[PDB]
Write a protein that binds this ligand. Sequence first.
Ligand SMILES: NC(=O)C1=CN([C@@H]2O[C@H](COP(=O)(O)OP(=O)(O)OC[C@H]3O[C@@H](n4cnc5c(N)ncnc54)[C@H](O)[C@@H]3O)[C@@H](O)[C@H]2O)C=CC1
Ligand SMILES: NC(=O)C1=CN([C@@H]2O[C@H](COP(=O)(O)OP(=O)(O)OC[C@H]3O[C@@H](n4cnc5c(N)ncnc54)[C@H](O)[C@@H]3O)[C@@H](O)[C@H]2O)C=CC1
Ligand SMILES: NC(=O)C1=CN([C@@H]2O[C@H](COP(=O)(O)OP(=O)(O)OC[C@H]3O[C@@H](n4cnc5c(N)ncnc54)[C@H](O)[C@@H]3O)[C@@H](O)[C@H]2O)C=CC1
Ligand SMILES: NC(=O)C1=CN([C@@H]2O[C@H](COP(=O)(O)OP(=O)(O)OC[C@H]3O[C@@H](n4cnc5c(N)ncnc54)[C@H](O)[C@@H]3O)[C@@H](O)[C@H]2O)C=CC1
Ligand SMILES: NC(=O)C1=CN([C@@H]2O[C@H](COP(=O)(O)OP(=O)(O)OC[C@H]3O[C@@H](n4cnc5c(N)ncnc54)[C@H](O)[C@@H]3O)[C@@H](O)[C@H]2O)C=CC1
Ligand SMILES: NC(=O)C1=CN([C@@H]2O[C@H](COP(=O)(O)OP(=O)(O)OC[C@H]3O[C@@H](n4cnc5c(N)ncnc54)[C@H](O)[C@@H]3O)[C@@H](O)[C@H]2O)C=CC1
Ligand SMILES: Nc1nc2c(ncn2[C@@H]2O[C@H](COP(=O)(O)OP(=O)(O)OP(=O)(O)O)[C@@H](O)[C@H]2O)c(=O)[nH]1
Ligand SMILES: Nc1nc2c(ncn2[C@@H]2O[C@H](COP(=O)(O)OP(=O)(O)OP(=O)(O)O)[C@@H](O)[C@H]2O)c(=O)[nH]1
Ligand SMILES: Nc1nc2c(ncn2[C@@H]2O[C@H](COP(=O)(O)OP(=O)(O)OP(=O)(O)O)[C@@H](O)[C@H]2O)c(=O)[nH]1
Ligand SMILES: N[C@@H](CCC(=O)O)C(=O)O
Ligand SMILES: N[C@@H](CCC(=O)O)C(=O)O
Ligand SMILES: N[C@@H](CCC(=O)O)C(=O)O
Lengths: 501, 501, 501
Amino acid sequence: ADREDDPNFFKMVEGFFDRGASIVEDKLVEDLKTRETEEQKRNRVRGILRIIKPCNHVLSLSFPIRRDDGSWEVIEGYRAQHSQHRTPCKGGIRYSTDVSVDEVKALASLMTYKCAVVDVPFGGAKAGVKINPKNYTDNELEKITRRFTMELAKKGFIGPGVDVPAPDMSTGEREMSWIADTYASTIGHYDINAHACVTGKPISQGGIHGRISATGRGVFHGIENFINEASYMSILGMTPGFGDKTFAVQGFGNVGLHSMRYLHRFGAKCVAVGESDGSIWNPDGIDPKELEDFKLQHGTILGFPKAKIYEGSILEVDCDILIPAASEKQLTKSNAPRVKAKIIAEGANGPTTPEADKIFLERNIMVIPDLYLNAGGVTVSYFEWLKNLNHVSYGRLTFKYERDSNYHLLMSVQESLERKFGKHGGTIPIVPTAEFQDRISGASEKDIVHSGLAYTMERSARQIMRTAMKYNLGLDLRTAAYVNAIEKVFRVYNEAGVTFT
Amino acid sequence: ADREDDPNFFKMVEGFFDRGASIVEDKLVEDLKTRETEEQKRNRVRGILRIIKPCNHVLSLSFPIRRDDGSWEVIEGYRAQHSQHRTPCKGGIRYSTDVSVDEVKALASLMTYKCAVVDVPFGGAKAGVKINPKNYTDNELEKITRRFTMELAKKGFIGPGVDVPAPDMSTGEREMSWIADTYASTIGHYDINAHACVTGKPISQGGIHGRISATGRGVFHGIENFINEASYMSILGMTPGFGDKTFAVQGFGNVGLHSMRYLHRFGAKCVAVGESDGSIWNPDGIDPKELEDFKLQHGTILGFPKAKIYEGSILEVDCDILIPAASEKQLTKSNAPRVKAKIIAEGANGPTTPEADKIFLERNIMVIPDLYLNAGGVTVSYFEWLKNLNHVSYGRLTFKYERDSNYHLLMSVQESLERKFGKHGGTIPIVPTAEFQDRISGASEKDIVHSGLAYTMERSARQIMRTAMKYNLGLDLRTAAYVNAIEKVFRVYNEAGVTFT
Amino acid sequence: ADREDDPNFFKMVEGFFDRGASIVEDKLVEDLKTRETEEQKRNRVRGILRIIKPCNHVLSLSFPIRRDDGSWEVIEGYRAQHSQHRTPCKGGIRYSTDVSVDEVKALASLMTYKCAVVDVPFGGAKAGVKINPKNYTDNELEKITRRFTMELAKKGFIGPGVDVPAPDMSTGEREMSWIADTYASTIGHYDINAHACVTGKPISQGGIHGRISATGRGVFHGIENFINEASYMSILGMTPGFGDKTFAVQGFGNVGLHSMRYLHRFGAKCVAVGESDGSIWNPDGIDPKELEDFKLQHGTILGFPKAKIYEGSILEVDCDILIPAASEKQLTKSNAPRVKAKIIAEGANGPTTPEADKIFLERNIMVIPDLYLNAGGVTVSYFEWLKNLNHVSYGRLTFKYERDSNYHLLMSVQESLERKFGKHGGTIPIVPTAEFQDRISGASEKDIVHSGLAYTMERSARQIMRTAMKYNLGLDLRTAAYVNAIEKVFRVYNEAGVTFT
Ligand SMILES: NC(=O)C1=CN([C@@H]2O[C@H](COP(=O)(O)OP(=O)(O)OC[C@H]3O[C@@H](n4cnc5c(N)ncnc54)[C@H](O)[C@@H]3O)[C@@H](O)[C@H]2O)C=CC1
Ligand SMILES: NC(=O)C1=CN([C@@H]2O[C@H](COP(=O)(O)OP(=O)(O)OC[C@H]3O[C@@H](n4cnc5c(N)ncnc54)[C@H](O)[C@@H]3O)[C@@H](O)[C@H]2O)C=CC1
Ligand SMILES: NC(=O)C1=CN([C@@H]2O[C@H](COP(=O)(O)OP(=O)(O)OC[C@H]3O[C@@H](n4cnc5c(N)ncnc54)[C@H](O)[C@@H]3O)[C@@H](O)[C@H]2O)C=CC1
Ligand SMILES: NC(=O)C1=CN([C@@H]2O[C@H](COP(=O)(O)OP(=O)(O)OC[C@H]3O[C@@H](n4cnc5c(N)ncnc54)[C@H](O)[C@@H]3O)[C@@H](O)[C@H]2O)C=CC1
Ligand SMILES: NC(=O)C1=CN([C@@H]2O[C@H](COP(=O)(O)OP(=O)(O)OC[C@H]3O[C@@H](n4cnc5c(N)ncnc54)[C@H](O)[C@@H]3O)[C@@H](O)[C@H]2O)C=CC1
Ligand SMILES: NC(=O)C1=CN([C@@H]2O[C@H](COP(=O)(O)OP(=O)(O)OC[C@H]3O[C@@H](n4cnc5c(N)ncnc54)[C@H](O)[C@@H]3O)[C@@H](O)[C@H]2O)C=CC1
Ligand SMILES: Nc1nc2c(ncn2[C@@H]2O[C@H](COP(=O)(O)OP(=O)(O)OP(=O)(O)O)[C@@H](O)[C@H]2O)c(=O)[nH]1
Ligand SMILES: Nc1nc2c(ncn2[C@@H]2O[C@H](COP(=O)(O)OP(=O)(O)OP(=O)(O)O)[C@@H](O)[C@H]2O)c(=O)[nH]1
Ligand SMILES: Nc1nc2c(ncn2[C@@H]2O[C@H](COP(=O)(O)OP(=O)(O)OP(=O)(O)O)[C@@H](O)[C@H]2O)c(=O)[nH]1
Ligand SMILES: N[C@@H](CCC(=O)O)C(=O)O
Ligand SMILES: N[C@@H](CCC(=O)O)C(=O)O
Ligand SMILES: N[C@@H](CCC(=O)O)C(=O)O
């Protein structure tokens, strides 16, 4: 944590909101066309916004466990539900000591708008267990997450139609596998959609393919849709395309390692990798496989053979693209000036504070907002949820049909050409290309996740790019997204009677 | 609020706990008799205590209402569940702007031990809606409490087997009548015990006789069982009995008005009555029926014809018995020295801070602790709960039997005496006394509440007086009660496996 | 039942398991990637296998039915749930006097692996009512199955998210229609997915097209994918293709009649048909839609005009392909030597005992295992289940789109060719082939069942073939399938924490 700029997390995000609030508030009053045409439209709007910003529910949990050494410990744990204009709430579970109600109240709110950015029909939620996960044995962490699932389940803070958790900092597949099992074996025993209570699940437990990457893949597509618009690259003095760029990732978690993998593939070059014990560096480039294989073996990126051990801030490392994939409030009033880089891809949730945005705005540094960029996490989870509901491995019912159907479709173009060019213009093979033989049978689960994600990272980027053009926000993409979010979330409340009254 | 001594409410009550924790800690290790005789007994005790102290659950609510003037307002609202060693949780709903999570986390904990004092089998809960209730119209207050019931019901913070609210500051019958009706008409629709979700209900709604008084009646019984022990009255330099005492009540609510009524009856004089706008005074005595009739008509005690307004603190009024029936943290390090008086009957929840107890201890001033004294509220509610479970007006099935049975019992003593004293002994009428003609048919609902309350304000004062003798606490009755509470609450956790693990 | 080889049914199938257990045990330890790398990877593999083998749950039912003649009779009835690594359990209901807990414990286990073979996400279950169904009137059989549904429903052994029965020996559509109706009208009254509690339902009740055939269709696909692989036909000394083969089916039920129909169509020629009263024979060929018309009219295949009555065991009939579609344990140590045939297509559940496999292995006789071959039953049921969850007749929402879309797609190939070949080159009709006019609108429910089944009988055969090659099992396809099943079922347990603990 910084101190010069360590603003309250929930209020910080409220700040981002209140800015989007004003910028559409005119439009919201404008298409509202009710009888009560006045500034009653405005106060009907300025009331519904006041209903949105604050969280609907927060549950606080002091629950015991008996540690491995026979002793008793009390665990603090929180789950804020921000909005519910879409049931079920969505949002991850975070294991840290930083965990605090305001931090979960903040992340939850982010999930509300984040889902509104990428048109996932979930209300925002989040949750923290206030533990250093390093300091508990795996059996302790199991007994902790299972118990946390119970106490959440009993008070209505996890359920396929109510609230669907997912992984986050220091939680992943394993934790999610437990959360399902408890709910499936206990309270959700008769629930057919029981295993749809939580995403990020291991594939064998009902998870969806590519969800672990997913968030990092979406990070790729988010940087892409912008870095391949010279209209913005003209404003950063950079060339369109990944081919020649250099980047740096703070954090090497599920968002870091996979944001590094998907860029080091589709073009650019990793220069430096951070972690909560220090960074490594190499301008020549760092291979993600080698580094990952070194973090698996030795549990730290430090001491990488093919990269020095950068003294200094990772956020300041000279590069093109800075990807904070760590915790929040990392770029602040004080270090934001020194960031030497040109594109900020917020992988992590709110890693940049509003005072860093004002600097980055001035310094013509493009911050790709947290709302849009890591929405790949929720999007693929949103798929993992529908998979759990449709109870089929996607593609299965149809494969040998849009296959045979296409081979017959092709055989029509063929017979029709032969049937005009005689036994005596030849035989005309109509045959799938190489990059159609791989789609000849249609959508597999692998593919849907990719294209389903690819589509809405692209679509929702233009939805931002219009709005940044429209209201003339330029490189203030953060305000552009919250404008879109505030509008979509409002549409629900407006056409609803707003409350059971 | 004071500012020399305005300690954190939850931590304040934790303070009272930690004191009781140490004093029995030895005994708890003592009767524990496990295989693992050590100071694992002590750490197995000190762990279970660490599980008790902190609340199990807190739910935080920002829910909208439409005010009367068509506008939207967001309402903040909290319900901490302290313990659950007894389901269902019990505890009131408070309407104030003082409402804060720490204040509800504090009161909830008090309800846990309060129920343990008077052997009510409920875990402690409480709840606040953070509104000034006077600033909302009755229609607003209705759709505020109804909505608050919903959001509590949905997240599992109200239910006959889960959590049973009750009235408190600025809530009473009317609110409770709403809380039932929503739950009964909505979520608890099929629940046979639906109307058992909340106590303090109007009699016509399933309430129990004398519940509104109840808390103030129990306040009478509590002062009584002590003021009629010269062993304590020798230590205060005061005479046993109510007949000659004078008393002052801060606050004129459900706890004030009825603590005043039940003492001005069974003996002593009212000298002064406080309220959040000032106090009235009259050493000659103040009649509760006249005052109440003046507060009903004019909505304030100020300007009472037969009592001027008192210049100065109501708590400092010269008198025998000080009854704070207001909000908490009223007697503090700074005004506790000046308190004229000799018996402090804490009607309100925690109206005295731990530093005031230090002074009162020194100054030989007997503070009758909040745990024991206002437990009449929960006790009669506990009856109101059983009534809604037994679905019978108490006494109904038996009246004309323990009636006819007694008249036949009497007719046996008679015939048997005649059957020995022949003719020439006369006829010997055996006839109920006047007081026994009123009980000839047995327990009515009125009576059970009285004696059922009377019993356990007695049986539990005993249990405190035993323990203040035992561990030699003298006039530290507050520590005496927490000693009983901590022991009873522990007795559950110990014989339980402590957690599903 | 045989005498020399009548092994315990559950232990028999355990035998098939334990064989597959050892063969992958090495691999399972191999890809296990834990840092407890020892031969304690082996013992936690050996533990997880020990958890798989035995059934999780068996429910035993003595329930009364009143017969038609006013009298009372008690009905014995069992439902073992083998595994639950996939909810909901799947598996049929069998009406026989052979029914015994061991026999249901056995079939249930088979359903677990059977679903793992063909990647249906269900745990294995089965159920028997211990009645001779011919000895009860249809109104008796109705009140029997309805009552059996209740007692199963109440104890949690039937439910769309819990356990989904289906037909089996002496049960079919009619019984399944009842099972739905009771649970739809009673316990599942509010359940939206109520009618998804049971498959095999009549089409009008929520059933899926072709489910009655389905199992026999899949029997066709199974024999096919092998008999069209000369790599195995070289090993049996037989020619690839159906065109010239002769087969014999023991049993003429849902599995027999439709295994006969789908082969007598797509090539080969029925030689003999068994039933529980004797067989018929005709080397010239037997038409299924004469023999069925004779069984419908006369309730027996015996005395078929165009086929004499056969003089000995149906299993011993000289032919190419032996299809046991009867009860289990039919080919044993004693008659397995004299089976005069080259391909054994286990339609029935476990019709061949492990000692018969030992002979068939030696005698180079290919047994197509029960796991793989009749998995068409569960597969189409698995479709019937998803249909009742998706609440739409498949294909409906899209028909007139992938139709118009294709006609527009074709119109693009056309206009683009015309756009290049001018008025000079003519008009170039692009027109669907005959085959493709029947798919022009896309997947109907009929088609999905076919291709959806066709695919996975074809995707899962070529998971067996490329495990029989891998671990060199040759014509031991039964061990090859259990190797796949044990692996897929393992994977869930491994990545799960394995139990609530
Ligand atoms: N798992 C998922 O699907 C999603 C995660 N996110 C966000 O990504 C961010 C974190 O990524 P995770 O997925 O939880 O992976 P993670 O929890 O495994 O990442 C943390 C790793 O990076 C290091 N690290 C943590 N904080 C650091 C800091 N301030 N400075 C330097 N190094 C630090 C730590 O040593 C740790 O090893 C969060 O903001 C999270 O909300 C959002 C999209 C999806
Ligand atoms: N206990 C449960 O019911 C859980 C829910 N599911 C549901 O399964 C449905 C269908 O797709 P998936 O089964 O996930 O297969 P999948 O093809 O999507 O991939 C899952 C992995 O497990 C393998 N697998 C296939 N059948 C399996 C079986 N019966 N048991 C264990 N592993 C099997 C697959 O070959 C694959 O390697 C999903 O819609 C999901 O909702 C799957 C996991 C656990
Ligand atoms: N209603 C019940 O059955 C139970 C309530 N209590 C406690 O009694 C106390 C309050 O009385 P209630 O009947 O609950 O509600 P109430 O609102 O009817 O009574 C409170 C009275 O005291 C006045 N007041 C509030 N704060 C004051 C302050 N700082 N200074 C001077 N006057 C103030 C208020 O104007 C009001 O007249 C609280 O501690 C409450 O939690 C405890 C036992 C049972
Ligand atoms: N809507 C409601 O009022 C609900 C209340 N209940 C149960 O009602 C039960 C009966 O208690 P009570 O008989 O009221 O106490 P009670 O002790 O006062 O019964 C005798 C007197 O109460 C009056 N009374 C009795 N039943 C009444 C009724 N249904 N409506 C209006 N006045 C009535 C009569 O004037 C009678 O003289 C309670 O025990 C409660 O469990 C449960 C469901 C709904
Ligand atoms: N309907 C389904 O879903 C599928 C059924 N199976 C299995 O196929 C076998 C046949 O059952 P279904 O076709 O389903 O219904 P079914 O009950 O109508 O078929 C039974 C046929 O076999 C005859 N039969 C009984 N015992 C015999 C014996 N010792 N010798 C010769 N014939 C005998 C019966 O009289 C009748 O001809 C069963 O073992 C079943 O487990 C396997 C998977 C799918
Ligand atoms: N009753 C159930 O089983 C529940 C499941 N669903 C699902 O909704 C869909 C129902 O469509 P289907 O009627 O099965 O397909 P469909 O309309 O193509 O007709 C198929 C069969 O249903 C009957 N049928 C034809 N038209 C009908 C009509 N307008 N209304 C009622 N029956 C008609 C005929 O017997 C025909 O053989 C299915 O997917 C079903 O699984 C929906 C609600 C409850
Ligand atoms: N730890 C780690 N995970 C990987 C690595 N490569 C891929 N993954 C993840 O592992 C899963 C299996 O990946 P693949 O079988 O290669 O399939 P894919 O669709 O090509 O996946 P991607 O190339 O990652 O988009 C994917 O969901 C990836 O997210 C790697 O090198 N290390
Ligand atoms: N608010 C209020 N209620 C009263 C008062 N007096 C009586 N009641 C109610 O009417 C019932 C009959 O009163 P009483 O005849 O005096 O008998 P009681 O129950 O011993 O009186 P209390 O305990 O003082 O209420 C009581 O149980 C009370 O519920 C009063 O002065 N004020
Ligand atoms: N019992 C019986 N059912 C038949 C027979 N022929 C057709 N069917 C029914 O028809 C269904 C499917 O038939 P079709 O719609 O004609 O499909 P198809 O491609 O023309 O050929 P099939 O599926 O073999 O009949 C089967 O599931 C049976 O229910 C028959 O000879 N006997
Ligand atoms: N925790 C991730 C993923 C949320 C989810 O997939 O539900 C996020 O906040 O974006
Ligand atoms: N609010 C009162 C009454 C609670 C109840 O009766 O449940 C108290 O805290 O004692
Ligand atoms: N009874 C059949 C069908 C099971 C099902 O479709 O559920 C079998 O065991 O394969």
